[model samples]
Target chain A: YRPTLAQLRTFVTIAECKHFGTAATKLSISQPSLSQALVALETGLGVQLIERKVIVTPAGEKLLPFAKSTLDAAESFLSHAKGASLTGPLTVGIIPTAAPYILPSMLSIVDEEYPDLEPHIVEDQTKHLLALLRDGAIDVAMMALPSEAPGMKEIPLYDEDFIVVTASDHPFAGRQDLELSALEDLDLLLLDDGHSLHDQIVDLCRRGDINPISSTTAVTRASSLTTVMQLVVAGLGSTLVPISAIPWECTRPGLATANFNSDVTANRRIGLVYRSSSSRAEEFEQFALILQRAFQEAVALAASTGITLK
Target chain B: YRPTLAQLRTFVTIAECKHFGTAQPSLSQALVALETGLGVQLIEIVTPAGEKLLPFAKSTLDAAESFLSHAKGANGSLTGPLTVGIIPTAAPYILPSMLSIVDEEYPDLEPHIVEDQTKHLLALLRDGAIDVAMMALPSEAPGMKEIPLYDEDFIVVTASDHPFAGRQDLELSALEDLDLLLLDDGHSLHDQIVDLCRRAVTRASSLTTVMQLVVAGLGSTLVPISAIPWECTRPGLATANFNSDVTANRRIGLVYRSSSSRAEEFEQFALILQRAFQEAVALAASTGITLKQ
Candidate 1:
């Protein structure tokens, strides 16, 4: 059944008020019809606005957040549309692995970047992320660098350093520093192909002349950092993981990690890439400033140094 | 200046007419000048209702899709509504996840689930692929379920001896032993998880696991089947899970048109978990015909 605006408003007011008789007086609808309007709203939403009579249900509470936002946006639209500084919707594409970490931390930055930039961040892997960026589906992208987009400009955020992570107190934990050459004998754990880190590790292996298959090691690629870290703790030998991958087991007292003390750092340059032609470049360039501040602060509270770009 | 309803209508009609003189003469000066005054000399050039008046824009073609829906769900009053999106796969995964208290809790379903998109899930809010539209968010969506109250998740479905068979919480790094099956790469779900989840998992490489995996029990990848519950009819293989860092689940909500008029009848499917669906998913289609709605 279709719900009218007046009926919905009356129902919402009554649900918030908790007393239909009082709500009817407030909204000028009869108590019987006030309860019925709420009943109709509930019928329309497929959820009860209030549980019995005392409190709002999860469904009712769930509606509050979005309902408030919807109203606020409309109010702001009506008032803010007159301002010349109004910004439009900006779609940001983030790779699956990055969005989990990136979005939560930088949401405030986006909120502050352009007060009205309705940032919509979408998650996909590198290939799809690239396609989305090229298709104008997203204004900016947080992804791995070295993506083959000639026209794409980048705000090289930082290099994500891959470290050698082993179980807590593994024999390697005794070392003052670690070497990629030393990894020759270590049973290695990789994130497998699709992940850029996996490719980075593979390239490191190829350049180091370590044929993983020829070495006496159980070379396995894991889909998650938990399993990889768990395997290393299970005595599976050494695995390469980002620095943030450490201190996770510290709460339980069972994890360990060390930086790659090599002639070269085993790392992938992560950057926020966008089209040079994008009209939003100025906004994103400014956004980069806010994000860098967050990375320096919000990245995991581990002991390793963060590659926060100043 | 903010474009109004009259301006949009006039522009749209003139663009359809495609001529300055013909459209111009057809334009009503009294209506065009209403923003100012009807009697004022607001009309530089007077016109009738049948003359060529204005130009067409790209946005005009874009709005036509929704405008053609009879401006269906696009109402400014969208302020006080509750939106729930349902995917075609809702009946299968959602049942197990919501089976416990879903019936008692959302019995009235505070929100509504609309079915609009299932193919690309692009028109997410309208096409009915995600709970929120134009947004692909995944995090803290932890411990939800096969239905994934969180990130867009995939489940592993296979037969015994299938490399993933017998292993409890198998890791993706172990796919080296089996030929992994997947949906067509372009599908939004496929692209979202392809490389980060597992490289080389493909549909073109291996047709969808449901119809293809049954007799052609060749490929084994980590993904939950939608319409077909591979667990019930597995040729004798146990469905094992792949382990990932506290992150494995993905977004799979009962998405629907945010402005769906019939939300009450719609969310009933998402309100509870149909047990028969838990053991086997292919039957969900039939069970849906019997449930809450």
Candidate 2:
């Protein structure tokens, strides 16, 4: 629907020629066909350019002066196309958990390093994020890897091991770690579906063939970390806590701490993944160190408040 | 030498069709020619325009977002034909005289009048004070009527003894009033000689004749004057300022000033013709009247 340079040129010529027949001859087309072009132009521009007798209407007259200027612009656009440099805003997507820590840590470094590069983030889930990544809605993703999806590759940063947290009076409260078999038949609460970390838990469940009792629709939805702990404290169920969750659990009077005690750790390694064959594979790799540094600084801060990482 | 619409279309078609003479002739030509014709809209305009290309460049793209918001003007000139030069035949010679005389005499010469008679009546002319009668251009004996003159004014009515018997035109002041240039040319005077007084009234005498004369690069001439103000005021001529609504008209002429004298006696009489003009102008003004037709 947008007017292009070619269509604009058509208008300018019709104005100049005045007589449609001659304009057509000059434009080198049959009279009716040229008229058709003029009609197209008029429809696009939304103005009556010529009358039945080929008289230029007031509207046509008004546009006459601008014809040359449009042609001038078309000239420049063509010239620019000959040697134009590409530039525009580039949008990317990151998760809420990762957004706060990732931008501050990596943004300035990348901005300083690559002046032409722009980073934009969108909130996305695995199913949608994979679609967006393939369609080029995002250049890179900064979250844990999804289960094997077609056309995706993973970039391992450092292992992001999830430790268990329980209420003070709850069983296994003092444990340093827990094995996968201990979590069997337990009501496992989780963050809502959007977070890629939620998918990681789903992968763990599916991988271990672990199934809980009759499931309720609301059993596994938590909008935030506070909601996760609030649900855990309310005796809704025990939740798999990320390394960053300890600070909140330690401060809350009702909560307790526990870790996997068995030989087998129920931890899923966190890394960045993209369509492995993507043009931006190198770009995603570039941000791995940034995520590692941010998580390390964060875990270190939480340790000062009795939420130390294992 | 920018590419015309056809050239640009040709370029686009070459891109689309890939081959020049190889594509279907109708479609190829159609596509190539669409450079200026396509992507444009038809606009309506009034017919019989005085200003050709009055709205030569009004296009919808002028409302384009990129250029219209902060800066309304496009790259090339969007509005122009800014100043029009509407010139008649006597623009060069007589116009300078009138302008200079207006500067020296009236200051405001008010520019309100051109043959005096016509200017005083015109509202737009009076408002703009547009009068600028150029000087006469001639190297003749009796003086040639101005030719190459344009302007829709001045209707010519011819008669043998009616006032415009000759091509020698006196000033409108002389002819508009009933005397030398005036008394002789009025309806009553022409009526006394023939029973066709009503016809004489309608007869413009030498109205548009001056226009054709102007077009031919010549001037106009009027019939013989009674007093012929230049020669004698006593017996030669007398003035009667008539306000009769008889399509009263006058022939416009062109004349150049002289610092030197003339060679021929006949041309000398013609050269000394300013007196009748001066007397007619003075006499007409005396009656709360003007020398305009």
Candidate 3:
């Protein structure tokens, strides 16, 4: 009485797309066949998986994770049986902050090095990427170090400092020797909650004797650093940007970048993360070297644009 | 054009049973459908392509089995290797009891032990190198769940002729002026001892070495009550407990990843550990060494 893999695949796709027509298109099957599979699966389980409007039933919701794990294992099996690592489809998850800076060089390097490999990119926040990694939707993840998730293996790549971004005429602009204490009484705009950058900036401010909740005005909370930078360019409030992002985010006409003094511990380590059970640990380690190279190239590009990242 | 689960199951069964006739009547049809869907011969004495797919098929079946177990929550008996990390300070004293209890409770469970310092054990836990860890509590590690087992007081170990030897009413302030000996860096005990005395002291790599030094009158040292039976047996050494007003104790606990699927098993294992600790304490009492839970 168990649902077959075909039916499970259909259910999963329908759940992901939330539309039968779209799921049919994605699966390259006709609408009638997709409906038949769903109907058969629902009947076999004696419960409705999806309502008429495509909302998953409670039973379906509870079982979704198991279905995803089964599919992931099937794909892993197929990939292993094929006997070549990184030669087929490979999904890479990256945090939003690291994506814009490292992706271009990384894509180019991957294209040149692993021509047979097709890379699928997903840009998300750290928590979403971690959930996706655990669900096996993504093969590898690039984000901050110490992911601290059980069953994950972290391979540290490099560390980068955090730079201050401000309006062109702001008091902290164009200064490289300012201590973190200078942030006191300043209106510090920050990314919205759930972004690791948001927490890191708050921690740094507290370390520098600034109370983040009181002294820093929450005039704007942005989901993207780009939006945060745009707000800064409008002279709303200043914000912190990781040095890797300076070349892209600091180039706006009204934006300027500055650095904390040498004593401030204001840097973050970025690295590759993958499931320890993955058979491609060796391949991921090798790919980490390319990622390191791509990071250096990104820093060099920033330096060429007069933004020196230390 | 994907193969159905039934077809994959049939193919896997044929591979495992190694004979098509041993499977159901529709086995031939299922194999044909699977081969056509995958565009590879998976039978006929397991072709090269079949050989390539066998391990993957087995893994997929295992995953499906786990998924089914998750659905029913039955017949999920614990088996396989369980890597448990123990801090060096606790390993020698606690392992004999813990290991015997685990053997008695779950004979099928294979326990692999890793002994190291607290920091290293935490690192190993986070990296998935080990499944669970035993160490002093308040690990404060993010993404880990801690279960406090018991608290045991620390006892001062001094040379038999020392002024503080065999005294039970000594206050915490008494150790401020004495030359304390401690385990070297990386042991949580080293940091704990420093926090208690509020000063640095000479260090050794092992409690055995520390005890040898204490017996030679190099310096005095503090040992957890569980270790008194083992470390205080030398002729030149004497042990003393702190005053009832003084709080010189550490909470021992079990820590594991929050995402672990074996949480229920680990909880049961924690109960076994508590019982074992109690047994060790009772055994120590029988030998004239008083220990506490």
Top-scoring candidate (DockQ): 3
Error of 1 at B72 (Å): 13
lDDT of 3 by residue, B1-293 (tens): 54556766876886778654564467688888777766666777888667656776777777677655444422234444568898888788888888898787777666889999889999999977888999887888999999989986777888988998778877666877568886532223222233553325466888999988888889898887777777778689887776666667778899998856557767877897788788767766766854322
* TM-score comparison, 1 vs 2, better candidate: 1
On TM-score, the stronger of 1 and 3 is: 3
Give lDDT tens digits, candidate 2, residues A1-310. 4445455556677766757767778767687877677787677656665665466554454455455566664554333222111112335555554455445645666566545445566766655766787787776665555546667777776655566666666787767655555666357776532222222133354465745457645446776667778877877777776665455444687877666544544444556766666554554566666567766765775677765455
DockQ of 1: 0.04
Task: Go through the candidates in order and give each one's DockQ.
Answer: 0.04, 0.01, 0.14
Range of the 10 consecutive residues with the lowest summed lDDT in candidate 3 chain B: B184-193
Candidate number with greatest TM-score? 3
What is the alpha-carbon interface RMSD for each candidate?
11.7, 16.6, 6.6
Query: TM-score per candidate, in order?
Result: 0.43, 0.35, 0.48
For candidate 2, write residues B1-293 as lDDT tens digits. 23343334334333334345542566455433432343321112221210111122222234333322312221122221111111232122233333454355433112332443322313322232321222222213232222222111222222223344233333334344322211222222221223333212222224233323323323223322221222212221222222333223333332222211111211322222233334344543454312324
Query: Can you rank all candidates by TM-score, best first?
Result: 3, 1, 2
Error of 3 at A221 (Å): 40
User: For model 3, which pairs clash?
Assistant: none
| Candidate 1 residue A269 C-alpha distance from true site, Å | 0.9
